């Protein structure tokens, strides 16, 4: 059924002459009929199971090439096909792994709102099944409070693969959160502590932070401006707008209603 | 139809504990916050307290070298302009009625 | 006027006639179940030191 | 339009409610929601009162019966029309927006809006949704500290 | 969602995607709203085809949003369709 697929799907195609074939096949599956459901031809499952297989394998080999902007296309379309249902058999090799991977990606962009709004679509597999799904929510739970040592040490235990392109940027956004937290007006920190608090012994990446953000480290002092008092004694702005206000009170008080 | 909200509650448990502590004292060492919260490590107590400060749970600051946490006190809200605003809104409503 | 028609439903349907006038919920919560023997709480504290 | 004053003043407003209830009672909800979208659209143009209150509540109701996105609608909704309401529909509209705010990790301002929701219910004996809103209020206030 | 198809290059692909959206817009407008700028990118630019369809779908979504001047401008732009 217009397959032309069984060549280098299982075997790895490290940027082989493949993306052209994916483009061809997606054009063709567009041509054949409904690439997105319009409702009909229910018994016709081959154009459906084929479609979901194509999309999932494309995303699986897309994470390898690190197309973060494109990756969302495939993941969204897989989400579309996981809910028309009809009578299609749901189970695949994935339908768990792909959701756990989507979950990690969504967390690493540091947008936990939609992360939490997506937990409202799988009602009984959360704390019971699919270790692929128990690991990410466990990670978010640990990130909810300040305990981070376990998060760093959890790298030894990974569900399926390296997942590197999703956990490395997670460690970087942890960098960001810690930096955004350790602010507020505190005292001098010597050139050892804030370096050894996170990970790095004494490289220039701490220097990159220093010359990237503020805290001029002159007399060993890292200082962040966390006073921002401003607003002095400024009766004049009242003296205008309050006069406007009172004139209005007296306006709509004696005029005939 | 409300199970998922309460499934995440333990962390806000520890948050409530530290908030009541914040309201109790003013100047307190970290050598006791974790000790009386059953938290064994005093390194992560820094982190949980700092986050609690970030989102506005408690108003204190931290002296990382010294080891004490003190909370600022801001008073005399009568002298500011905000009560005038709170009253003006109600004046408008009553005239509307 | 007071229609109160409701798709939401009643839901459900004592040995507690001890109404202590009002509240005590915070009060009973304060000494939930411990620190009971206040006499002993003092006495076995003055001999401690 | 000719008898729109009377026809939409009531009768229609309650009709939509009962017709929706039927479907919920022992049926599906979907083409109902398509019909509701269409009927909301035909309002908001000729008329702007109670045709934008009952429909808003019903539509958000069936969205919440499942667990969809549920937010991208409120932002452009224009809010339940003020200036007129039965003060009843304001109550459940507030309850709905309160819930959809609480589930999306926005706690602090959920309690105030849903408490405002609760204070608008009548003195009537029915404890149908008063139990519900109280239960949700307790659980959101165990958050924070 | 399907709107993501507007990002990939293929003119035939995009001319399928937006050609189908105008069927479901009649109630997905609240979702579609957050991308009308991107749709408008493919209008009043000659590097596209059946561009009047883009104009039409713009007038649809703006009509639902009640920004009636936008709708009228894009209806004059779409013309005969």
Curated annotation (Swiss-Prot), chain A:
Cellular component, GO, one term: nucleoplasm
Domain of life: Eukaryota
Cross-link (Glycyl lysine isopeptide (Lys-Gly) (interchain with G-Cter in SUMO2)): 204
Keywords per UniProt: Isopeptide bond, Phosphoprotein, Proteasome, Ubl conjugation
Modified residues (Phosphoserine): 13
Ranges for domain PCI: 69-238
Transmembrane segments: none
BP GO terms, sorted: proteasome-mediated ubiquitin-dependent protein catabolic process
Family: Belongs to the proteasome subunit S14 family.
Function: Component of the 26S proteasome, a multiprotein complex involved in the ATP-dependent degradation of ubiquitinated proteins. This complex plays a key role in the maintenance of protein homeostasis by removing misfolded or damaged proteins, which could impair cellular functions, and by removing proteins whose functions are no longer required. Therefore, the proteasome participates in numerous cellular processes, including cell cycle progression, apoptosis, or DNA damage repair.
Record's subunit section: Component of the 19S proteasome regulatory particle complex. The 26S proteasome consists of a 20S core particle (CP) and two 19S regulatory subunits (RP). The regulatory particle is made of a lid composed of 9 subunits including PSMD8, a base containing 6 ATPases and few additional components. Interacts with DDI2. Interacts with TASOR.
Protein name stated in the entry: 26S proteasome non-ATPase regulatory subunit 8
Biological source species: Homo sapiens (Human)
Gene coding for it: PSMD8
Range covered out of full length: 94 to 350 of 350
UniProtKB/Swiss-Prot annotation, chain C:
A GO BP entry: proteasome assembly
Cellular location(s): Nucleus
Pfam entry (one): DSS1_SEM1
Disulfide bonds: none
Keyword Nucleus: yes
Tissue: Expressed in limb bud, craniofacial primordia and skin.
The keyword rRNA-binding appears for this protein: no
One GO term describing the cellular component: protein-containing complex
Keywords from the named record: Nucleus, Proteasome
Similarity section: Belongs to the DSS1/SEM1 family.
Subunit structure: Component of the 19S proteasome regulatory particle complex. The 26S proteasome consists of a 20S core particle (CP) and two 19S regulatory subunits (RP). The regulatory particle is made of a lid composed of 9 subunits including SEM1, a base containing 6 ATPases and few additional components. Belongs to the TREX-2 complex (transcription and export complex 2), composed of at least ENY2, GANP, PCID2, SEM1, and either centrin CETN2 or CETN3. Component of the homologous recombination repair (HR) complex composed of ERCC5/XPG, BRCA2, PALB2, DSS1 and RAD51. Interacts with the C-terminal of BRCA2.
Protein name: 26S proteasome complex subunit SEM1
Organism: Homo sapiens
From Swiss-Prot, chain D:
Domain of life: Eukaryota
Subunit note: Component of the 19S proteasome regulatory particle complex. The 26S proteasome consists of a 20S core particle (CP) and two 19S regulatory subunits (RP). The regulatory particle is made of a lid composed of 9 subunits including PSMD3, a base containing 6 ATPases and few additional components. Interacts with UBQLN1 (via ubiquitin-like domain). Interacts with ERCC6.
Function: Component of the 26S proteasome, a multiprotein complex involved in the ATP-dependent degradation of ubiquitinated proteins. This complex plays a key role in the maintenance of protein homeostasis by removing misfolded or damaged proteins, which could impair cellular functions, and by removing proteins whose functions are no longer required. Therefore, the proteasome participates in numerous cellular processes, including cell cycle progression, apoptosis, or DNA damage repair.
Family: Belongs to the proteasome subunit S3 family.
Name assigned to this protein: 26S proteasome non-ATPase regulatory subunit 3
Native source species: Homo sapiens
Lineage: Eukaryota, Metazoa, Chordata, Craniata, Vertebrata
Protein encoded by which gene: PSMD3
Residues of the full protein shown: 196 to 340 of 534
Curated annotation (Swiss-Prot), chain E:
Subunit details: Component of the 19S proteasome regulatory particle complex. The 26S proteasome consists of a 20S core particle (CP) and two 19S regulatory subunits (RP). The regulatory particle is made of a lid composed of 9 subunits, a base containing 6 ATPases and few additional components including PSMD1. Interacts with ADRM1. Interacts with ZFAND1.
Family under the similarity heading: Belongs to the proteasome subunit S1 family.
Function: Component of the 26S proteasome, a multiprotein complex involved in the ATP-dependent degradation of ubiquitinated proteins. This complex plays a key role in the maintenance of protein homeostasis by removing misfolded or damaged proteins, which could impair cellular functions, and by removing proteins whose functions are no longer required. Therefore, the proteasome participates in numerous cellular processes, including cell cycle progression, apoptosis, or DNA damage repair.
Protein name as it appears in the record: 26S proteasome non-ATPase regulatory subunit 1
Gene designation: PSMD1
Source species: Homo sapiens (Human)
């Amino acid at each position: 059924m217009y397959e032309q697929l069984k060549g280098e799907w299982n075997r790895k195609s490290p940027n082989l002459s493949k993306c052209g074939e994916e483009l061809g096949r997606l054009k063709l599956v567009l041509l054949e009929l409904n690439f997105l459901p319009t409702t009909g031809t229910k018994l016709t499952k081959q154009q459906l199971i084929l479609a979901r297989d194509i999309l999932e394998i494309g995303a699986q080999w897309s994470i390898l090439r690190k197309d973060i902007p494109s990756f969302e296309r495939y993941m969204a379309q897989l989400k579309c096909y996981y809910f028309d249902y009809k009578e299609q058999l749901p189970e695949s090799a994935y339908m768990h792994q792909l959701l756990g991977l989507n979950l990690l990606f969504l967390l690493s962009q540091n947008r936990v709102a939609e992360f939490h709004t997506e937990l409202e679509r799988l009602p009984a597999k959360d704390i019971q099944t699919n270790v692929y799904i128990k690991h990410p929510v466990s990670l978010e739970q640990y990130l909810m409070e300040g305990s981070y040592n376990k998060v760093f040490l959890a790298k030894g235990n990974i569900p399926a693969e390296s997942y590197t392109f999703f956990i490395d940027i997670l460690l970087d956004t942890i960098r960001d959160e810690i930096a955004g937290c350790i602010e507020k007006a505190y005292e001098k920190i010597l050139f050892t502590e804030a370096t050894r608090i996170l990970f790095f012994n004494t490289p220039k990446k701490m220097t990159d932070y220093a010359k990237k953000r503020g805290w001029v480290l002159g007399p060993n002092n890292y200082y962040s401006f966390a006073s921002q008092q401003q607003k002095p004694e400024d009766t004049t702005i009242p003296s205008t707008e309050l006069a406007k206000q009172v004139i209005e009170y007296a306006r709509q008080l004696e005029m005939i209603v | 139809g409300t199970y998922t909200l309460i499934i995440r509650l333990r962390h806000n448990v520890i948050k409530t504990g530290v908030r009541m502590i914040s309201l109790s004292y003013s100047r307190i060492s970290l050598a006791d916050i974790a000790q009386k919260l059953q938290l064994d490590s005093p390194e992560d107590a820094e982190f949980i307290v700092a986050k609690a400060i970030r989102d506005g749970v408690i108003e204190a600051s931290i002296n990382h070298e010294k080891g004490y946490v003190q909370s600022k006190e801001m008073i005399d809200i009568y002298s500011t302009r905000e009560p005038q605003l709170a009253f003006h809104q109600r004046i408008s409503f009553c005239l509307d009625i | 006027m007071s229609e109160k028609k409701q798709p939401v439903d009643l839901g459900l349907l004592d040995a507690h006639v001890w109404e202590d006038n009002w509240d005590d919920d915070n009060v009973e919560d304060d000494f939930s179940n411990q620190l009971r023997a206040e006499l002993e709480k003092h006495g076995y504290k003055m001999e401690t030191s | 339009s000719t008898q729109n004053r009377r026809a939409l003043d009531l009768v229609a407003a309650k009709c939509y409610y009962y017709h929706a209830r039927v479907y919920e009672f022992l049926d599906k909800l979907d083409v109902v929601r398509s019909f509701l979208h269409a009927r909301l659209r035909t309002a908001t143009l000729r008329h702007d009162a109670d045709g934008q209150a009952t429909l808003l509540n019903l539509l958000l109701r069936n969205y919440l019966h499942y667990s969809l996105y549920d937010q991208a609608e409120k932002l452009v909704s224009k809010s339940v029309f003020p200036e007129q309401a039965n003060n009843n529909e304001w109550a459940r509209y507030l309850y709905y927006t309160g819930r959809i705010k609480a589930i999306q990790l926005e706690y602090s301002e959920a309690r105030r809006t849903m408490t405002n929701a609760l204070r608008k219910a009548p003195q009537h004996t029915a404890v149908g949704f008063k139990q519900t809103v109280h239960k949700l209020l307790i659980v959101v206030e165990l958050l924070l500290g | 969602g399907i709107i993501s198809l507007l990002d990939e290059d293929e003119p035939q692909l995009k001319e399928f995607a937006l050609h189908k959206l105008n069927a479901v817009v009649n109630d997905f407008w609240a979702e579609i709203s957050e991308s009308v700028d991107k749709i408008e990118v493919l209008y009043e630019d000659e590097g596209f085809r059946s561009r009047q369809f883009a104009a039409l779908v713009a007038s649809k979504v703006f009509y639902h949003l009640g920004a009636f001047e936008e709708s009228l401008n894009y209806a004059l732009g779409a013309g005969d369709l």
